[model samples]
Target: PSHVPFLLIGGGTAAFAAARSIRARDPGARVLIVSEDPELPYMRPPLSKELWFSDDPNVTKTLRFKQANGKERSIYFQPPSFYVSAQDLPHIENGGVAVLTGKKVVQLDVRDNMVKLNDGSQITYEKCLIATGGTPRSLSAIDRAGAEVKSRTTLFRKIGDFRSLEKISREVKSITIIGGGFLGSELACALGRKARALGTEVIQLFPEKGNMGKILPEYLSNWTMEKVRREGVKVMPNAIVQSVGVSSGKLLIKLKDGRKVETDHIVAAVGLEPNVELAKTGGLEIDSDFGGFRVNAELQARSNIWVAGDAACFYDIKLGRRRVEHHDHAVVSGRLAGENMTGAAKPYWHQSMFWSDLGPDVGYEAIGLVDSSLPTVGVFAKGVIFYLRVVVGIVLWNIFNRMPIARKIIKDGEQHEDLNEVAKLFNIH
Candidate 1:
């Protein structure tokens, strides 16, 4: 082939999956992975969980090869040695592999399957995958506050965000979290656990009803609220912050509903916006609804162009809607894009899954998708389970290391299909 078989843009989970899936479908194909992130792909789930608690903050960003007990191990979310021995897959260290790091795509010529880099170089490919993920929204909203209070407001996105928060946690005795969505809730729960360990407190400010309101049903939302209270984290529901500033060496926050919260520091976890500027400059198609790249069911964009991850939306076969910007969905979509790029004509059809660590005592697992009106069942001693109009998804909560239940829900689709059946199978007490 005159051109590289696959050129994957981005260095997050989706981009890594696309490259690996292509390797699985066609081991000998020429693949080039380009990423603007200097670090290699690392698991992002821990960014809000165990990373801050761990004694060592340094982690393997890109894939790495190491030797342990006389065996070479591929270190990442999953050790490479495991894939080698279990799936018989080639390790990432194999020769002829070109992974260009710290290179940003400036534009793309879809007609000729070429991408222009910021360095004025062109990478022509027979197939291209745009897996660039979403970036953290601007922190300018915090800038309106006084210099002292603005310095206390932090947004957690990357490792640097975690490190900065860690430093602040040492000096601050209490924290006030703004925007009680998933990120905010999970962070509050995780930070609650950390605070308890270190003798601190966390107050969560939620503009909506509670956590997971956008995705979880009413019953689950209520269940989450109770859980948050049980964790010793203060929950402020139906509360809005009007402004943030510093007063008397403390962070002062004014709420629209005439409530005020003062703490040593503030963390904003409102939401994120899709990153499509790079794709727009490339002249590729963008989705007007969500401002992401538009791709087909097979994940192909143009002739040899494709997109996945948070930057692209594909027609979800199961949900019957175009959705983008989910971690698990991103993995599946990227896998499909990679497979199709390497000549496997398979359609993308995968259920969405997500989980959040609610401190050490609890975590929430969302299996499949559910609508708001669906009935919900709570396994108070174990976890929470929900159903669609006919029982389609299950949400699990681990009171004490209950992640096993969450993992089972995702691994065994049968449990996710019917709540009663799942509760019976596990012999819920």
Candidate 2:
């Protein structure tokens, strides 16, 4: 019945971040966040780390990550009580502006500036931001082959996913995790740490030579492989999973190399596909590369429509039309999207950064872009090595001792410091 200045679709990280920023900039502007998920906007870093062990059913309460030291990390993105607090609740009130949860936008009448919901309800808005986020790649193929395996295969994408695995983890004796990217690697360590504490065993399977091989150099990747092994996880690199089957009440994993590993449970952390069905059905411009929204440098879709975060195939100015899927990238992109939605015409061009933890090992940190064309510098130390992709200063330290050096390199990105100077600064070879 009333008109709203802005309507935000998909109440995930990007949507929430944009809403908060928009509210800060303009208090009187109507901000509505519509999401398919029933819960309010929440952080997902904990889904793999902190919330995996938590018994709390409320997804909002477990919206924080846990550090290597076994402490909960800060929720710097949003205030403590923003989720359930009464004051902030009425700011985006239900009557003035609404977050239509448990509903999908079936049609986008771009010309009319309105969105059609699944129930055939049409809502008009001046501007809209699409932050639909992503979903886990299906494991149905693996499930079909592994029908006999008693182990339950689950993904760590949302609070429900974590809760599902947490219930299953309590009964399983051994757990095998598939994929060695950041999510898989960190989850391997997290599951291993949790299982070891419960006196159980954990195993990790990697499709690549080491964890984060695409973004990390050879030395640090190898170091990560070694660290997971030290933590009692059977590290198998270049081991492609063909199928997971149940045999004699145990889970049997058939590798691409014709090897089989038996475990009690399986966790698939391979990758995520952008939740673009809504966009596709609505005829929004989708990226051919990965099925995400084709967005410009300004984070805008055709005309006033904007897309951000994991859902958007954003254009990279330096990397030349590259799309990234990282938490930090999502935050910065959300900020830019919100600014653009509120009439700021600035472009989005932020460097992507990533970090992960593998049990006690600090894992690695990568900043900026570093692909095959870059010259990789590997500094091997006592037990670890600093793998630096010199072109963009992407630092990967698989060993904890090299973190100090890695942090310095990340800080010196725009300084034009020479290799020798950087090496001497970190005492690296």
Candidate 3:
């Protein structure tokens, strides 16, 4: 059994951010990061965004982290030296900030204050943070069309998936992408453009009335769908793929509306399921409303046991219980968890922000809940403010300057006696 002062389970953006925060606060604390991924922590957004369009065979290999000083460095969040040397803590066999890769945590023994790995190794920690993140939701074969669709279907989540898609895109002439969310939209636009350059075809199918129907307004969603279609992608709205099967070496996707489309590859960007098995087995409370380990305002599941990132369904001071699966949320929650672990007791009050790029020209930076069902009021081309009765969400379009104003409106709108007056302050009619 190995003993450490601080243990971080799972290694992604959140885990790495927590490690950096922990090291910043206490340089001497012995920290270890255990992950199932063999690769070091890398940005996940690019997997569906920039990396897909790159012509380089080693595009992922060429990725490097940008330091605060604007210098591009190696993939590791912190240099190896930071892990190797500690001011006061005794170094482990490898180093202080040790990372064990290609290892799955089978069980978390909270009662015994230990973690059991798949290989029968045990590790004990004084303080632990679980940032295991989430796994991509896979479609059932029944949902596909009574076919064993694993071979033809690709769940666009991991770095490997990006590589596989890139390889397949080169050989195939047509591709079908299911789901019209951020990943699906981005990939469709990106791969659509790529395939167009080669005179290939791209089809995007979703059950929503328009692209990004869940978040964007109907008008915006319709515009985005049209823009994507203009870029040579076939936009199929209110379309559900009922079944998929391989026929004559081509994948045939049968839609619920009695439509069948043949394509070389099928990509599913449905969503993610929070990785909460360890939390459940460890006897931590799981959020019933949202999946993931239920955590308090301080991102603590229990005393000395913290949860962060997508795996943590934490109570938002403003938005109630929420589980955000975005880069901003991951970094903020990870750092907050790290700080709270050191007895800061600072409640996480920061509103997380997320952004998505549809193409070179169109994108959105949103804060708080940006549900399309919510009533919206604002200038569309300038900026759009979404509110659920009171101001709870804001979606900034091309107008980035109004973000601060939008945030202020969301934060202080509830206190204002006249909601119209608050809108007037932002020059919104």
Candidate 4:
């Protein structure tokens, strides 16, 4: 299309959320979404965790996640039919969102409010939103390794990564996951569960002392690592990989400590690097500390150029400036960005929530600023962990759906005399 009233860059949940919010505010607004992925907008979290833990009889055939209560769903935010086709996007009567898949916007001209695609096509827009999201950080050794190592190793993220990893998880004898963060830990648990049925070994190797060490407290972090280990994944902590090489059709990870791990497949779950290449042409600035596009409280990189999701480093009133990569944050930031784009003139005042599971019973839901260095009170009995830069963050370990209480606690911003007493407010039985 030559022109669009609204242009959304990205093919993830953030863009979809923004589109919904935009439609809600300006119902007849023509919106065009440019996505690099061949598929439409989809949720990324489930691709590693819940999607693998299904009991559906037809799960193998359907390739869908079946919940504990017998519900089944796709990873996509919307079905193919949910979006109007790009061919019909321009001529539509009432304006609607159209997704253009498998196309990358190489340059964004902020002055002209236009973006040029990799395929030598350009689209102008009145308002443009950059929810470009992030990509997995690659291990340089694996990246520079032989072709054999390259073929088997997976720097895990997105639909393309999931499909290949899913297929190979069954075929491999052992799949070793790197990184102890959420993505690595969750997928290791998933593969551990799925591996048992087929005699495939699952091993997790990370440099951290425990799983999610950066986010969880020391005691809780080690505890979480134990939970991951019990899931049948061999846990390797304080692992420093020197190099990854292919020898005799097997992959070998040589550690700096002189330990070598041999596995048929490698899944690197290290971390994400924000997709900020468009910033070069757009003249947008990125946050030095946070590594994301810098935005004010309103989530705008520029007056007409909005940013959301993992790409947006926003200023939180209480938490200061930071970037959140969780699904909930993506949705909240995206919605707020869309609202502001429609002249709502609202600041992003909402707190975002994050949740992840190591096993079926081992889950965590957290909100606000969470850091390991922060002082925390752990009520392990009630599965509650409260981080205090004076009640700034809360982690409900294995606690089900207590975010409303946790969110309010952070919002209230109170320093309690008796944390043990305040811990009971979550109805900890």
Winning candidate number (lDDT): 4
Per-residue CA lDDT of model 1 for 76-131, tens digit only, reads 44443323221111234442335576888888877677888889887678788888
RMSD of 2: 4.5
Residue lDDT tens for model 4, 112-157: 8889999999999999899999988988888788888878888878
Between candidates 1 and 3, which one is better according to lDDT? Answer: 3
Worst window of 10 by summed lDDT in candidate 2 = 382-391
Q: Sort by TM-score, best first.
A: 4, 3, 2, 1
Instruction: For residues 285-399, write the lDDT of model 3, one tens digit per residue.
Output: 9988899999998999888899999999998787788889989889999999888878888777877788887876776788888888888765542455565657788776654
lDDT of model number 2 = 0.69
* Model 1 poorest ten-residue lDDT run: 82-91
Candidate order, lDDT descending: 4, 3, 2, 1
lDDT of 2 at 96: 31
RMSD list, candidates in order: 6.0, 4.5, 3.3, 1.5
Candidate 4 deviant stretches above 4 angstroms: 56-63, 68-70
TM-score of 2: 0.83
Clashes of 2: 5
